[PDB]
Amino acid sequence: MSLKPRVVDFDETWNKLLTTIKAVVMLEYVERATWNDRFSDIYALCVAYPEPLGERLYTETKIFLENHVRHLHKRVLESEEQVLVMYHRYWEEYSKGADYMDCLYRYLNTQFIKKNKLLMEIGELALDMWRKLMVEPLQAILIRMLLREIKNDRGGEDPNQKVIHGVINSFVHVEQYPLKFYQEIFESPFLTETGEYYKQEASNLLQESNCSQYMEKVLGRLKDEEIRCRKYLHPSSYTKVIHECQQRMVADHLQFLHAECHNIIRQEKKNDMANMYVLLRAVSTGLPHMIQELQNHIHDEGLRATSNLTQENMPTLFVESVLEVHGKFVQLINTVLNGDQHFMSALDKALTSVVNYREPKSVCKAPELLAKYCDNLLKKSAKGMTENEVEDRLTSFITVFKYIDDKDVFQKFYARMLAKRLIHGLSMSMDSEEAMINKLKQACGYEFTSKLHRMYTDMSVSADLNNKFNNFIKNQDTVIDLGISFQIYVLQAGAWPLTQAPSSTFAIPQELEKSVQMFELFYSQHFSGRKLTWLHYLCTGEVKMNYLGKPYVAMVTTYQMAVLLAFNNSETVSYKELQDSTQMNEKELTKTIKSLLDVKMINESSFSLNMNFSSKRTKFKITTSMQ
Amino acid sequence: LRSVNSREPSQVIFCNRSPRVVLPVWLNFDGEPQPYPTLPPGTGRRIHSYRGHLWLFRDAGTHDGLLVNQTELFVPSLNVDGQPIFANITLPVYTLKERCLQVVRSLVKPENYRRLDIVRSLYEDLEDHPNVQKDLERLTQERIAH
Amino acid sequence: MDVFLMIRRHKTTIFTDAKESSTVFELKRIVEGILKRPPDEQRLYKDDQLLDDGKTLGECGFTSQTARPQAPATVGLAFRADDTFEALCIEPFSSPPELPDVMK
Amino acid sequence: KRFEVKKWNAVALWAWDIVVDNCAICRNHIMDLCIECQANQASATSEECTVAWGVCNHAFHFHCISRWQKYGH
Amino acid sequence: AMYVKLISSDGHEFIVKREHALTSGTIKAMLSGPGQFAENETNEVNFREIPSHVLSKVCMYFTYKVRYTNSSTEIPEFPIAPEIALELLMAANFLDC
Amino acid sequence: SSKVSEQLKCCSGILKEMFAKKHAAYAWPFYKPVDVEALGLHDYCDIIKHPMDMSTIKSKLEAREYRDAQEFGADVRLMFSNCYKYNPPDHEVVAMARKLQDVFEMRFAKMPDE
Ligand SMILES: Cc1ncsc1-c1ccc(CNC(=O)[C@@H]2C[C@@H](O)CN2C(=O)[C@@H](NC(=O)COCCOCCOCCNC(=O)C[C@@H]2N=C(c3ccc(Cl)cc3)c3c(sc(C)c3C)-n3c(C)nnc32)C(C)(C)C)cc1
Ligand SMILES: [Zn+2]
Ligand SMILES: [Zn+2]
Ligand SMILES: [Zn+2]
């Protein structure tokens, strides 16, 4: 049709509109005639001419809404023996009457507020009023029934999940037009009941069970409480209930928990430790006392274990103790309690206390011990390990010694020791030394090994510039002959220490003197690294004398060889003769003389050459003492 | 509704298919917009403007707002990559409601507003429509909801 | 293409988006879907020249190139009436009055 | 008395030598660094940003000397 | 139902959708209140105060809006006739959807 | 061919120094055609009849159609003076044009002969 305008009759229109509202809301399916006539009547009422009829029609609708609220309230008040079920059913009936909300009253939704506004919301206000008429007076009964059902479920009976959920939902769902309704309706009483229950349960359990039993029962109860909160509430307050229970049970007993935690940690009851750590992790104050006790116990155990070290193998014992303690503590803590960075810091502090414990009456030589341990692990005379094992040991030692006090002292000791071990001809692998140095340089910084770099560049600069001069000689004019190979390192000369300043000018054998002089003559061209003093205390070699009982020359140092090259003048000499020929001081002269006399190399002091010198090995060396 | 006085060139002319004459709103030092010359429906208008400027499209002979590039207004950008671009013109959700309000305002002069065979709701409530400062402020009211 | 159609017959009313390249037989199938009267008994005509179900939307000249966006495309509707197809009958709509004494 | 051998090790060397010439424009120490050349008392790497010109008797501060013989430091 | 049977008072029977106008949340919410439910749901609409040609043009416009609501294709303008402007003004001021 | 000129090299250097971000922020519209039909200036070109810009100077210097840096100076003077005669004497436009021309001259105050 194409319907022209019309004049409406208020009374008949209201009667017809009510006759459709009743058949729609009342859970009844009505004829298509009424279905189609409802909207037509509504429009005819809303289209009054030549004036408005809103005030009247809207007043009638509002009276209808108030009547619905009051009638629902009374019908529910008929619910004495079925309060909760009746409340749920009536709320569901109203919710279904609104769930038909895709039918008619969009005009009511959006043609009144924008007729006297920018006085409430219409459908939301209808829900709120229906709650006021029945819910607003019956809140006592509804809350009481909910609490009774919760208590009964806590006792062992089966509750009414769907009814509980809907009854809880509606009151918050009153106003759409956000946490006002629900967060002001249920959260408070729910949390209050949960807190009372948790307080009673914790008070009973604290005496009804031991620490581990209480912790396990509390974990199970917390899981059950989370399940119940999920079943009977939304995520807006589940955290509130859980936190209230946690404060009641795992919070109020923090002091007793820490009192037992000393023994718990000292007993390493993995399950109990995990339970305590979990219960205290979310708590502000749960960590500190346990962390302190654990750190103290670990440090004390490590120190006590290390006290029994055998004098022969001190570095090995220290390394083993540190590795064992660190491994056990890290494994336990990271397996039990989610890996607290506070636990990592406490482990670092305990390890530092263990390592930096220096006995009174002596200086703490831990860095020197570690450096010597690394040197021994890299040694070529102590078999039992592989190169990969050495690399792993260095990697472990870096993280172990991260907390050693004497960093600079350890560095200087290692530098001197490696300098000696390379001066002696024992560094079987500059690459293995460089792997240890790679650990030390990935850990100790760039300045940590700038000195090592200089010392290496010195072994080279000597190697490099001297080789250049030797090559220039190989391209030179005159002839040359060696008869004895040799090697040297004087380069950029400030990497490793040999720091004893000279005291007496050295007069060494012309044998090596010629090599030194030719080296200087070929070398003095175009380089500059170190320009330091003499670090040449390492002079020695051999010569084969076909004039003794047989040709036999054993290891002899530079002083002894120079004295014997003074023997290239006379075989019998007094002390003054050897002293002058060597240019050495009194202490070195006496030491060399005694060593040469007792070593079978010789036989108001006087000395003579040995013509019958012999030993158990035809190749034996007069030793240098400093070793 | 106050344009940005960047002075950084934005080399673009917006292809505006407005069926009337194209004289959109503009920006002043404090924000004063003024009409512009005629750009008819289908063709574009070319002018160099200032970076940071926000402007939209309307009907030159209707005076009603049609969302700037369908949005609030074609927006301010600087000159990088040197390419042309524009915030073109287009209707809002093409409303028979606005069409009827403006049709009443057109078939009856602005002095013919409260004179239906009806009561005095049409003029204000529905045909209190096209205006430059109004359209601008109301689009800005949307953008204040935003 | 989008051909705009609106069929007035008796007191009926129907509309859709009509394919210009598709079939008037498709239009009849749509009419069957909308009315419970398959294209078998349906009969649509652009004016009086009968548009066979083989004649597409462009067979009548009404397409999205000329179809009215604010008003539907003219369409006549005649259905099957027992042993014959009742002729197309569409009367005129409401009568419009003149303009007010000050608005014309 | 007998020695028909060759197999000493020996040593004598090492010839230290600082930077060489007169490098005054602003041009701080040729053997030290400039103001910012060697004002870095925690450093000695002046000796590697050093003061020399070439093999032709040049020297200066490190940076403003290079951009302004010993291979020394 | 397939269609939404909309008929005015003056004789004819017609069908129009609401989802088709959903961009018209006007339609989406005007079909938005008290429970109207039957097993044979076909969206029947009986009113006695609407114009016929106005309803037809409004149905065309509703199809347009349901095709253009977030659609990115070409769009025409709003077609109206100069016979019902005042009635449309009152009707809109009542509807606002 | 063209035997390179020291003035031409200094002109390339001046164009470079103009290629700094400092100058384009005010003479950037002059680095390209100040449209005569851009704002309805049917008489802008009638008044200024020597089309030129920073790009004009760059092109006249790169193409090798200029005799020396005096030509670049003359072109800069022509462009700046046309802008000034287009603008009034009480405006920021005069301020900017004078700033640009004076800066050009002062900076040219450091290029010697070749
Ligand atoms: C013929 C036509 N048909 C269809 S549309 C059209 C048409 C299109 C554009 C124009 C001119 N453009 C405008 O009116 C633009 C369009 C829109 O974006 C708004 N608008 C403005 O100019 C606005 N202006 C601004 O936002 C900047 O405001 C500064 C006010 O002065 C603008 C110009 O003054 C009025 C006329 N005078 C001139 O153009 C002198 C000219 N100005 C300028 C000039 C102008 C402004 C600034 Cl900030 C700097 C230089 C100028 C040059 S060369 C050059 C490249 C320019 C830009 N110049 C020189 C050299 N000497 N004189 C000039 C407005 C409305 C405030 C005047 C004229 C007609
Ligand atoms: Zn100097
Ligand atoms: Zn430097
Ligand atoms: Zn020289």
Q: Which domains does chain F have, with CATH numbers?
A: 6-108 (1.20.920.10)
Q: How far apart are CA A457 and CA A493, in angstroms?
A: 8
**Sign, Cα dihedral of A230, A234, A235, A239:** negative
Place of tokens 């309690």: A337
C74 pairs with which residues across the strands? C6
Atom nearest to F41 CA in ligand 1: 39
Kindly give the interhelix angle for A211-232 and A136-155, rounded to the nearest 10 degrees: 140
- How many C-beta neighbours within 10 Å does residue C18 have? 26
Nearest C-alpha in E relative to C32: E2
Q: How far is Cα A520 from Cα A99, in angstroms, rounded to an integer?
A: 107
Contact (Cβ atoms closer than 8 angstroms) between residue C5 and residue C28: no
- F10/F58 Cα distance (integer angstroms): 12
D7 vs A contacts (CB less than 8 Å): 483-485, 541-544, 553
> Do D and C count as touching (3 or more CB pairs closer than 8 A)?
no
CB contact under 8 Å between B118 and A52, yes or no, is no
Contacts of A108 (CB under 8 A, 6+ apart): A61, A122, A123, E33
Considering the domain architecture, whether residues B62 and B95 belong to the same structural domain is answered as no
Residues contacting ligand 1 via CB (< 6 Å): B 7, 26, 28, 34, 36-37, 45, 47, 49-50; F 29, 34, 39-40, 83, 86-87
CB A1 within 8 Å of CB E10: yes
Cβ(A448)–Cβ(A437) below 8 Å: no
CA angle E4, E8, E14 (to 5 degrees): 40
Instruction: Flag whether A touches D (3+ CB pairs, 8 A cutoff).
Output: yes
Superfamily per CATH, domain E5-95: Potassium Channel Kv1.1; Chain A (3.30.710.10)
Same domain, B80 and B134: no
* Ligand 1 centroid, distance to A548 Cα (angstroms): 115
Distance from Cα F80 to the centre of ligand 1, integer Å: 19
E74 touches chain B (CB under 8 A): no
Q: How far, in Å, is the centroid of ligand 3 from the Cα of D33?
A: 9
Question: How many angstroms separate the alpha carbon of residue F81 from the centre of ligand 1?
Answer: 20
Sort out which chain B residues have CB atoms less than 8 A from A51's CB and list them: 119
User: Per the structure, how many domains does chain D have?
Assistant: 1
Report how far residue A136's alpha carbon sits from residue C70's, in angstroms, rounded to the nearest whole number: 53
Contacts of A102 in chain E (CB under 8 A): 31-33, 36
- Domain with B101 in it: what CATH number? 1.10.750.10
Identify residue B132 by its one-letter amino acid code. Answer: V
Q: Cβ E92–B19 below 8 Å, yes or no?
A: no
Cα–Cα distance, A428 to A434 (Å, whole number): 12
Q: C34 vs E3: CB contact, 8 Å cut-off?
A: yes
Which residues does chain C have within 8 Å of residue E10's beta carbon, measured at their own beta carbons?
94
Beta strands E5-7; E45-46: pairing state = parallel
CA distance A167 to A91: 7
- Same domain membership, residue B100 and residue B83: no
- Give the Cα separation of A200 and A256 in Å (integer): 17
- From the CA of D48, the nearest ligand is 3
CB-CB contact of A124 with A109 (8 Å): no
Residue C2: helix, strand or coil by DSSP?
Answer: strand
Per-domain boundaries in chain C: 2-103
Tokens 């002390």 belong to residue: A575
Q: What is the DSSP letter of B71?
A: B
B29: exposed, middle or buried (Cβ count in 10 Å: 0-12, 13-18, 19+): exposed
Cα(A20)–Cα(A45) distance, integer angstroms: 14
Radius of gyration (Cα) for chain E, nearest Å?
Answer: 14
What is the DSSP track for C9-24?
A: -TT--EEEEEESSS-H
Distance D39 CA to ligand 3 centre (A): 10
Domain limits for position D51: 17-73
DSSP helix/strand/coil, C4: strand
Range of the domain at B113: 91-142
- Which of the listed residues B4, B16, B43, B47 should we mutate to test ligand 1's pocket, taking the one with most ligand atoms within 8 A of CB? B47
Q: What tokens does A116 get?
A: 């006297």
In chain A, what are the domains? 1-185 (1.20.1310.10), 306-340+347-438 (1.20.1310), 459-608 (3.30.230.130)
Our CA angle for E39, E45, E51, nearest 5°, is 170
Paired residues of B58 in beta bridges: B65
- The DSSP symbol for E20 reads G
A539 to chain D, minimum CA–CA distance in Å?
A: 5
Q: Give the Cβ contact number of residue B57 at 10 Å.
A: 28
User: Phi and psi of E74, rounded to 5°?
Assistant: -55, 155
Tokens of A292: 């302190």
Q: Per the CB < 8 Å rule, is D73 touching A528?
A: yes
In order, the DSSP letters of A144-186 are HHHHHHHHHHHHT----HHHHHHHHHHHHTT-----HHHHHHT
Do B80 and B20 fall into the same domain?
yes
Task: Compare CB distances from E94 to A1, A4, A46 and report the shortest one's residue.
Answer: A46
With respect to residue D70, please indicate whether it lies within any of the assigned structural domains. Answer: yes
Residue B115 forms contact with C (CB below 8 Å):
yes
DSSP annotation of A131: I
A127-161 exposure pattern, b = at least 16 Cβ within 10 A, e = fewer = bbbbbbbbbeebeebbeebbeebbeebeeeeebbe
Nearest in space to A588 (alpha carbons), one of A576, A579, A597: A579
First-to-last C-alpha distance (Å) of chain B: 14
Contact F83, F95 (CB under 8 A): no
Report how far residue A434's alpha carbon sits from residue A101's, in angstroms, rounded to the nearest whole number: 82
Architecture of domain C2-103: Roll (3.10)
Residues B26 and B53 in one domain: yes
Cα–Cα dist E30/E70, whole Å: 21
In total, how many domains does chain B have? 2
**What counts of helices (H) and strands (E) characterise chain D?**
2, 0
Q: Nearest C-alpha to atom 13 of ligand 1 is from which residue?
A: F39
Give the distance between the most distant pair of CA atoms in chain B. Answer: 60
Q: Give, in order, the Cα–Cα distances in Å from A583 to each of A503, A558, A589, B45.
A: 11, 11, 9, 104
Chain CA centroid to CA F109, Å: 16
The tokens describing F33, both together, are: 């055609």
Q: How many angstroms separate the CA atoms of B51 and B69, rounded?
A: 17
* Shared-domain flag, residues B9 and B50: yes
Resolution in Å equals 4.0
What CATH number should be reported for the domain holding residue B13? Answer: 2.60.40.780
* Dist. CA E4–CA E55, nearest whole Å: 14
**A16 CA to centre of own chain:** 76
